[PDB]
Amino acid sequence: PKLADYLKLFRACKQYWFVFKDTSIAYFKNKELEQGEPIEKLNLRGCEIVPDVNVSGRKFGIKLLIPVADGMNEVYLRCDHEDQYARWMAACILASKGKTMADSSYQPEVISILSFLKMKN
């Protein structure tokens, strides 16, 4: 169960290689480096998730509010399109509840998310 894509990061937008594993996201300068040392690794367990979507505007954003000792760490992921967004958003939603992509609810979740976007398309 691995999910890996180039996504744009806002806190300013820079594109990085992102890897979803377990309940965490890690990112790197590019995909040839995914083996080495991540720029940062974020555990999404117990995070808050805010969708930032404008289908006709071609905007597919994921705002993540990650609990830290001194508050929320705000992480904004911009996806390149609807299918990528559905897979990443579904993964984020499961992770916030402590679930991985191995959970049998992952693919139906991708499907649900996607149907709404296909319909607006």
Short mmCIF file of all heavy atoms in Angstrom, two decimals, residues 3 20 22-25 43-53 61-65 77 84-101 103 105-114 116-117:
data_model
loop_
_atom_site.label_atom_id
_atom_site.label_comp_id
_atom_site.label_asym_id
_atom_site.label_seq_id
_atom_site.Cartn_x
_atom_site.Cartn_y
_atom_site.Cartn_z
N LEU A 3 1.41 5.18 -2.00
CA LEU A 3 0.88 6.22 -2.83
C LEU A 3 2.00 7.22 -2.93
O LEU A 3 2.58 7.60 -1.91
CB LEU A 3 -0.37 6.81 -2.17
CG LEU A 3 -1.09 7.98 -2.83
CD1 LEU A 3 -1.56 7.60 -4.25
CD2 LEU A 3 -2.25 8.39 -1.93
N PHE A 20 2.93 8.56 0.63
CA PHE A 20 1.99 8.20 1.69
C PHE A 20 2.22 6.75 2.11
O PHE A 20 2.17 5.85 1.27
CB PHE A 20 0.53 8.38 1.23
CG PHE A 20 -0.42 8.72 2.36
CD1 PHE A 20 -1.14 9.91 2.35
CD2 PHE A 20 -0.56 7.87 3.45
CE1 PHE A 20 -2.00 10.23 3.39
CE2 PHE A 20 -1.42 8.18 4.49
CZ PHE A 20 -2.14 9.36 4.46
N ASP A 22 1.54 4.07 5.75
CA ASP A 22 0.97 3.94 7.09
C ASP A 22 -0.03 5.07 7.31
O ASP A 22 -0.99 5.20 6.57
CB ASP A 22 2.08 4.01 8.15
CG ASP A 22 3.19 3.02 7.89
OD1 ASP A 22 2.88 1.83 7.67
OD2 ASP A 22 4.38 3.43 7.88
N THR A 23 0.21 5.90 8.33
CA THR A 23 -0.61 7.09 8.56
C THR A 23 0.19 8.38 8.38
O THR A 23 -0.19 9.44 8.87
CB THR A 23 -1.27 7.08 9.97
OG1 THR A 23 -0.25 7.06 10.98
CG2 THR A 23 -2.15 5.85 10.13
N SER A 24 1.31 8.27 7.68
CA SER A 24 2.22 9.41 7.55
C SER A 24 2.50 9.80 6.11
O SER A 24 2.42 8.98 5.21
CB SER A 24 3.54 9.11 8.26
OG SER A 24 3.35 9.01 9.65
N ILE A 25 2.84 11.07 5.93
CA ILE A 25 3.30 11.60 4.66
C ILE A 25 4.74 12.12 4.81
O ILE A 25 5.07 12.79 5.80
CB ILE A 25 2.39 12.74 4.19
CG1 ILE A 25 1.02 12.16 3.81
CG2 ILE A 25 2.99 13.45 3.01
CD1 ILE A 25 -0.02 13.22 3.57
N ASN A 43 2.98 12.88 10.52
CA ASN A 43 1.97 11.92 10.94
C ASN A 43 0.61 12.62 10.98
O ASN A 43 0.44 13.66 11.63
CB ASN A 43 2.33 11.29 12.30
CG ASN A 43 1.61 9.95 12.54
OD1 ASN A 43 0.47 9.74 12.10
ND2 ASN A 43 2.29 9.03 13.23
N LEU A 44 -0.36 12.05 10.28
CA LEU A 44 -1.69 12.64 10.16
C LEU A 44 -2.70 12.09 11.18
O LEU A 44 -3.85 12.50 11.18
CB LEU A 44 -2.22 12.45 8.74
CG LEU A 44 -1.90 13.53 7.69
CD1 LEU A 44 -0.44 13.85 7.68
CD2 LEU A 44 -2.38 13.09 6.30
N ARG A 45 -2.28 11.18 12.05
CA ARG A 45 -3.22 10.63 13.02
C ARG A 45 -3.83 11.75 13.88
O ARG A 45 -3.12 12.52 14.50
CB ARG A 45 -2.55 9.58 13.90
CG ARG A 45 -3.53 8.64 14.59
CD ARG A 45 -2.82 7.72 15.58
NE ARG A 45 -3.15 6.30 15.36
CZ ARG A 45 -2.51 5.51 14.51
NH1 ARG A 45 -1.51 5.99 13.77
NH2 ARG A 45 -2.87 4.24 14.37
N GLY A 46 -5.15 11.85 13.88
CA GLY A 46 -5.83 12.87 14.66
C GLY A 46 -5.80 14.27 14.07
O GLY A 46 -6.09 15.25 14.77
N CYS A 47 -5.43 14.39 12.79
CA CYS A 47 -5.41 15.70 12.15
C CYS A 47 -6.82 16.12 11.73
O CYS A 47 -7.73 15.30 11.66
CB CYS A 47 -4.47 15.72 10.93
SG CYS A 47 -5.15 14.99 9.40
N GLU A 48 -6.99 17.41 11.47
CA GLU A 48 -8.23 17.90 10.89
C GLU A 48 -7.99 18.09 9.40
O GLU A 48 -6.89 18.45 8.98
CB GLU A 48 -8.66 19.21 11.54
CG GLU A 48 -9.24 19.05 12.94
CD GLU A 48 -9.39 20.38 13.67
OE1 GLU A 48 -9.29 21.43 13.00
OE2 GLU A 48 -9.59 20.37 14.90
N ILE A 49 -9.01 17.82 8.59
CA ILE A 49 -8.88 17.93 7.14
C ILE A 49 -9.92 18.88 6.56
O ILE A 49 -11.11 18.74 6.83
CB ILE A 49 -9.04 16.56 6.46
CG1 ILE A 49 -7.95 15.60 6.95
CG2 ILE A 49 -8.97 16.73 4.94
CD1 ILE A 49 -8.22 14.18 6.63
N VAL A 50 -9.45 19.83 5.75
CA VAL A 50 -10.35 20.77 5.07
C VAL A 50 -10.15 20.69 3.55
O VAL A 50 -9.07 20.99 3.05
CB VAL A 50 -10.14 22.22 5.58
CG1 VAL A 50 -11.09 23.19 4.89
CG2 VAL A 50 -10.35 22.29 7.10
N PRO A 51 -11.18 20.28 2.81
CA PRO A 51 -11.06 20.22 1.34
C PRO A 51 -11.04 21.64 0.79
O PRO A 51 -11.81 22.47 1.27
CB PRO A 51 -12.34 19.52 0.89
CG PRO A 51 -13.11 19.16 2.17
CD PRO A 51 -12.55 19.99 3.27
N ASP A 52 -10.20 21.91 -0.20
CA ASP A 52 -10.22 23.21 -0.87
C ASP A 52 -10.35 22.97 -2.38
O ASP A 52 -9.37 22.90 -3.11
CB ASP A 52 -8.95 24.01 -0.54
CG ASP A 52 -8.97 25.41 -1.14
OD1 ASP A 52 -10.06 25.95 -1.40
OD2 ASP A 52 -7.88 25.96 -1.36
N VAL A 53 -11.60 22.83 -2.82
CA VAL A 53 -11.86 22.39 -4.19
C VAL A 53 -12.68 23.39 -5.00
O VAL A 53 -13.70 23.89 -4.53
CB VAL A 53 -12.58 21.01 -4.20
CG1 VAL A 53 -12.99 20.64 -5.62
CG2 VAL A 53 -11.69 19.93 -3.58
N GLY A 61 -7.23 21.28 -3.67
CA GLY A 61 -6.39 21.45 -2.51
C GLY A 61 -6.81 20.62 -1.32
O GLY A 61 -8.01 20.37 -1.11
N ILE A 62 -5.82 20.20 -0.54
CA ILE A 62 -6.05 19.52 0.74
C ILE A 62 -5.38 20.32 1.86
O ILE A 62 -4.15 20.43 1.90
CB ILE A 62 -5.46 18.09 0.73
CG1 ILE A 62 -5.93 17.33 -0.52
CG2 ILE A 62 -5.82 17.33 2.04
CD1 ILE A 62 -5.32 15.98 -0.70
N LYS A 63 -6.18 20.90 2.75
CA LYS A 63 -5.62 21.60 3.91
C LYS A 63 -5.59 20.64 5.08
O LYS A 63 -6.61 20.08 5.45
CB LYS A 63 -6.42 22.85 4.28
CG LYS A 63 -5.73 23.69 5.36
CD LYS A 63 -6.65 24.77 5.92
CE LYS A 63 -6.84 25.91 4.93
NZ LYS A 63 -7.72 26.99 5.48
N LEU A 64 -4.40 20.44 5.64
CA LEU A 64 -4.23 19.55 6.79
C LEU A 64 -3.88 20.36 8.03
O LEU A 64 -2.99 21.20 8.00
CB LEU A 64 -3.11 18.54 6.51
CG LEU A 64 -3.30 17.65 5.28
CD1 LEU A 64 -2.03 16.84 5.01
CD2 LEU A 64 -4.49 16.74 5.48
N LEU A 65 -4.60 20.10 9.12
CA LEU A 65 -4.32 20.73 10.40
C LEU A 65 -3.78 19.67 11.35
O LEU A 65 -4.53 18.88 11.92
CB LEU A 65 -5.57 21.39 10.97
CG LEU A 65 -6.03 22.57 10.12
CD1 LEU A 65 -7.45 23.00 10.44
CD2 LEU A 65 -5.07 23.72 10.32
N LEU A 77 -1.70 20.86 0.66
CA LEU A 77 -1.25 20.11 -0.51
C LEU A 77 -2.12 20.42 -1.73
O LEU A 77 -3.34 20.21 -1.71
CB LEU A 77 -1.27 18.61 -0.24
CG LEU A 77 -0.49 18.09 0.97
CD1 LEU A 77 -0.72 16.59 1.12
CD2 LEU A 77 0.96 18.39 0.81
N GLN A 84 -6.02 12.15 -8.78
CA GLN A 84 -4.93 12.25 -7.81
C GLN A 84 -5.44 12.78 -6.46
O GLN A 84 -5.15 12.22 -5.38
CB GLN A 84 -3.82 13.15 -8.36
CG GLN A 84 -2.58 13.30 -7.46
CD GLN A 84 -1.58 14.30 -8.04
OE1 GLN A 84 -1.63 15.48 -7.74
NE2 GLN A 84 -0.69 13.81 -8.89
N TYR A 85 -6.20 13.87 -6.53
CA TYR A 85 -6.88 14.41 -5.36
C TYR A 85 -7.72 13.35 -4.62
O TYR A 85 -7.64 13.25 -3.40
CB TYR A 85 -7.74 15.62 -5.75
CG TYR A 85 -8.67 16.08 -4.63
CD1 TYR A 85 -8.24 16.99 -3.67
CD2 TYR A 85 -9.96 15.58 -4.52
CE1 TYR A 85 -9.08 17.41 -2.64
CE2 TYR A 85 -10.82 15.99 -3.49
CZ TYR A 85 -10.36 16.90 -2.56
OH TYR A 85 -11.20 17.32 -1.55
N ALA A 86 -8.53 12.58 -5.35
CA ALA A 86 -9.38 11.57 -4.71
C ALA A 86 -8.56 10.51 -3.94
O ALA A 86 -8.94 10.12 -2.85
CB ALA A 86 -10.30 10.90 -5.73
N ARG A 87 -7.45 10.07 -4.53
CA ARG A 87 -6.60 9.06 -3.89
C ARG A 87 -5.88 9.63 -2.66
O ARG A 87 -5.77 8.95 -1.64
CB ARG A 87 -5.60 8.49 -4.91
CG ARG A 87 -6.28 7.90 -6.16
CD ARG A 87 -5.31 7.12 -7.04
NE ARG A 87 -4.63 7.95 -8.03
CZ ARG A 87 -5.09 8.21 -9.26
NH1 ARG A 87 -6.25 7.70 -9.66
NH2 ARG A 87 -4.39 8.97 -10.09
N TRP A 88 -5.39 10.87 -2.77
CA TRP A 88 -4.68 11.51 -1.67
C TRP A 88 -5.62 11.93 -0.54
O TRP A 88 -5.30 11.76 0.63
CB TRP A 88 -3.79 12.67 -2.17
CG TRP A 88 -2.49 12.19 -2.76
CD1 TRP A 88 -2.25 11.83 -4.06
CD2 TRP A 88 -1.24 11.99 -2.06
NE1 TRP A 88 -0.94 11.42 -4.22
CE2 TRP A 88 -0.30 11.52 -3.01
CE3 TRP A 88 -0.83 12.18 -0.73
CZ2 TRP A 88 1.02 11.22 -2.66
CZ3 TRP A 88 0.48 11.88 -0.39
CH2 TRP A 88 1.40 11.41 -1.36
N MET A 89 -6.77 12.47 -0.90
CA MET A 89 -7.74 12.92 0.08
C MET A 89 -8.30 11.73 0.88
O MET A 89 -8.38 11.78 2.11
CB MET A 89 -8.87 13.74 -0.58
CG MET A 89 -10.02 14.13 0.38
SD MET A 89 -9.50 15.12 1.82
CE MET A 89 -9.81 16.79 1.27
N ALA A 90 -8.67 10.66 0.16
CA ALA A 90 -9.10 9.43 0.80
C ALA A 90 -8.06 8.87 1.76
O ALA A 90 -8.41 8.43 2.86
CB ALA A 90 -9.47 8.37 -0.24
N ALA A 91 -6.79 8.87 1.34
CA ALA A 91 -5.70 8.43 2.20
C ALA A 91 -5.60 9.30 3.45
O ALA A 91 -5.41 8.78 4.56
CB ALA A 91 -4.36 8.39 1.44
N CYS A 92 -5.73 10.61 3.28
CA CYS A 92 -5.64 11.54 4.41
C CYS A 92 -6.78 11.33 5.41
O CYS A 92 -6.58 11.42 6.63
CB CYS A 92 -5.64 12.99 3.95
SG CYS A 92 -4.10 13.54 3.14
N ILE A 93 -7.97 11.06 4.89
CA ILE A 93 -9.15 10.89 5.73
C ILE A 93 -9.02 9.63 6.58
O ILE A 93 -9.29 9.64 7.78
CB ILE A 93 -10.44 10.84 4.88
CG1 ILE A 93 -10.75 12.24 4.33
CG2 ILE A 93 -11.62 10.29 5.70
CD1 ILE A 93 -11.86 12.27 3.25
N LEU A 94 -8.59 8.54 5.96
CA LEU A 94 -8.35 7.31 6.71
C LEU A 94 -7.26 7.51 7.76
O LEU A 94 -7.41 7.09 8.90
CB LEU A 94 -8.00 6.15 5.77
CG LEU A 94 -9.18 5.26 5.35
CD1 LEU A 94 -10.30 6.08 4.71
CD2 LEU A 94 -8.70 4.15 4.42
N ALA A 95 -6.16 8.15 7.38
CA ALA A 95 -5.03 8.32 8.29
C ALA A 95 -5.41 9.12 9.53
O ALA A 95 -4.94 8.82 10.61
CB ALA A 95 -3.84 8.97 7.58
N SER A 96 -6.25 10.14 9.36
CA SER A 96 -6.61 10.98 10.48
C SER A 96 -7.33 10.16 11.55
O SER A 96 -7.24 10.46 12.75
CB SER A 96 -7.47 12.15 10.03
OG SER A 96 -8.70 11.70 9.50
N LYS A 97 -8.02 9.11 11.11
CA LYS A 97 -8.70 8.19 12.02
C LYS A 97 -7.82 7.01 12.42
O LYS A 97 -8.31 6.05 13.02
CB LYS A 97 -9.99 7.64 11.37
CG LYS A 97 -11.05 8.69 11.09
CD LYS A 97 -12.02 8.19 10.02
CE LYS A 97 -12.89 9.33 9.49
NZ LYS A 97 -13.85 8.89 8.44
N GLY A 98 -6.53 7.06 12.10
CA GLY A 98 -5.65 5.96 12.44
C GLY A 98 -5.69 4.77 11.49
O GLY A 98 -5.18 3.70 11.82
N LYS A 99 -6.27 4.94 10.30
CA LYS A 99 -6.37 3.84 9.34
C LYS A 99 -5.40 3.99 8.17
O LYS A 99 -5.09 5.10 7.75
CB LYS A 99 -7.81 3.70 8.82
CG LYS A 99 -8.84 3.45 9.91
CD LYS A 99 -9.45 2.08 9.79
CE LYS A 99 -10.40 1.77 10.95
NZ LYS A 99 -9.67 1.43 12.20
N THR A 100 -4.91 2.87 7.65
CA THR A 100 -4.03 2.91 6.49
C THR A 100 -4.79 2.55 5.21
O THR A 100 -5.96 2.14 5.26
CB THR A 100 -2.85 1.92 6.64
OG1 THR A 100 -3.28 0.60 6.28
CG2 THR A 100 -2.30 1.92 8.08
N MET A 101 -4.12 2.68 4.08
CA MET A 101 -4.71 2.37 2.78
C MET A 101 -4.99 0.88 2.61
O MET A 101 -5.69 0.49 1.67
CB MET A 101 -3.79 2.86 1.64
CG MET A 101 -3.74 4.37 1.55
SD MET A 101 -2.70 4.96 0.20
CE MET A 101 -1.09 4.38 0.77
N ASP A 103 -6.78 -0.72 4.74
CA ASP A 103 -8.17 -0.83 5.17
C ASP A 103 -9.16 -0.96 4.00
O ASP A 103 -9.06 -0.24 3.00
CB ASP A 103 -8.55 0.38 6.03
CG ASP A 103 -9.82 0.15 6.83
OD1 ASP A 103 -9.72 -0.39 7.95
OD2 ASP A 103 -10.91 0.53 6.36
N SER A 105 -11.90 0.14 3.48
CA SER A 105 -12.72 1.32 3.22
C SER A 105 -11.99 2.34 2.32
O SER A 105 -12.57 3.34 1.91
CB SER A 105 -13.11 2.00 4.53
OG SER A 105 -11.99 2.67 5.09
N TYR A 106 -10.73 2.09 2.01
CA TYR A 106 -9.95 3.04 1.22
C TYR A 106 -10.46 3.24 -0.21
O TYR A 106 -10.75 4.37 -0.63
CB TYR A 106 -8.47 2.66 1.18
CG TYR A 106 -7.68 3.60 0.29
CD1 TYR A 106 -7.53 4.94 0.63
CD2 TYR A 106 -7.11 3.16 -0.91
CE1 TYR A 106 -6.82 5.81 -0.18
CE2 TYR A 106 -6.40 4.03 -1.74
CZ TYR A 106 -6.26 5.35 -1.36
OH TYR A 106 -5.55 6.23 -2.16
N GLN A 107 -10.55 2.16 -0.97
CA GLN A 107 -11.00 2.24 -2.36
C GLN A 107 -12.44 2.75 -2.54
O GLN A 107 -12.70 3.55 -3.43
CB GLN A 107 -10.79 0.90 -3.09
CG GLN A 107 -9.33 0.59 -3.37
CD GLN A 107 -8.69 1.59 -4.34
OE1 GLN A 107 -9.38 2.32 -5.05
NE2 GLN A 107 -7.36 1.62 -4.36
N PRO A 108 -13.38 2.28 -1.71
CA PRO A 108 -14.72 2.87 -1.78
C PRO A 108 -14.69 4.37 -1.47
O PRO A 108 -15.48 5.13 -2.02
CB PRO A 108 -15.50 2.11 -0.71
CG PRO A 108 -14.84 0.75 -0.69
CD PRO A 108 -13.36 1.04 -0.89
N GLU A 109 -13.79 4.78 -0.59
CA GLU A 109 -13.66 6.18 -0.23
C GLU A 109 -13.15 7.01 -1.42
O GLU A 109 -13.68 8.09 -1.70
CB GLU A 109 -12.70 6.32 0.96
CG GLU A 109 -12.49 7.75 1.47
CD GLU A 109 -13.75 8.41 2.01
OE1 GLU A 109 -14.80 7.74 2.09
OE2 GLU A 109 -13.69 9.61 2.36
N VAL A 110 -12.12 6.51 -2.10
CA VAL A 110 -11.65 7.08 -3.35
C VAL A 110 -12.80 7.24 -4.34
O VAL A 110 -12.99 8.31 -4.91
CB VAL A 110 -10.54 6.21 -3.99
CG1 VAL A 110 -10.18 6.75 -5.39
CG2 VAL A 110 -9.31 6.16 -3.08
N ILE A 111 -13.55 6.16 -4.52
CA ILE A 111 -14.72 6.15 -5.38
C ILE A 111 -15.78 7.20 -5.02
O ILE A 111 -16.29 7.91 -5.90
CB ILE A 111 -15.40 4.77 -5.37
CG1 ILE A 111 -14.47 3.72 -6.00
CG2 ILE A 111 -16.75 4.83 -6.09
CD1 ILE A 111 -13.78 4.20 -7.24
N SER A 112 -16.11 7.30 -3.74
CA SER A 112 -17.09 8.30 -3.31
C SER A 112 -16.60 9.68 -3.70
O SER A 112 -17.27 10.41 -4.42
CB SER A 112 -17.31 8.25 -1.79
OG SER A 112 -17.57 6.94 -1.36
N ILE A 113 -15.42 10.04 -3.21
CA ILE A 113 -14.87 11.36 -3.46
C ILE A 113 -14.94 11.69 -4.96
O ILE A 113 -15.43 12.75 -5.35
CB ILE A 113 -13.43 11.46 -2.95
CG1 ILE A 113 -13.41 11.40 -1.41
CG2 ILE A 113 -12.79 12.76 -3.40
CD1 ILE A 113 -12.02 11.28 -0.83
N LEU A 114 -14.49 10.74 -5.77
CA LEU A 114 -14.34 10.91 -7.21
C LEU A 114 -15.65 11.13 -7.95
O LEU A 114 -15.69 11.89 -8.92
CB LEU A 114 -13.63 9.68 -7.78
CG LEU A 114 -12.84 9.87 -9.05
CD1 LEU A 114 -12.06 11.17 -8.99
CD2 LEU A 114 -11.92 8.68 -9.27
N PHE A 116 -18.30 12.68 -7.12
CA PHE A 116 -18.76 14.07 -7.00
C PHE A 116 -18.00 14.98 -7.95
O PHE A 116 -18.55 15.90 -8.56
CB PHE A 116 -18.57 14.54 -5.57
CG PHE A 116 -19.27 13.69 -4.57
CD1 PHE A 116 -18.62 13.27 -3.43
CD2 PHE A 116 -20.58 13.28 -4.79
CE1 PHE A 116 -19.27 12.47 -2.50
CE2 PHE A 116 -21.24 12.48 -3.87
CZ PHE A 116 -20.58 12.07 -2.72
N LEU A 117 -16.71 14.72 -8.08
CA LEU A 117 -15.89 15.49 -9.00
C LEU A 117 -16.21 15.18 -10.48
O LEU A 117 -16.31 16.10 -11.31
CB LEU A 117 -14.42 15.28 -8.68
CG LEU A 117 -14.03 15.34 -7.19
CD1 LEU A 117 -12.52 15.38 -7.08
CD2 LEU A 117 -14.64 16.54 -6.49
#
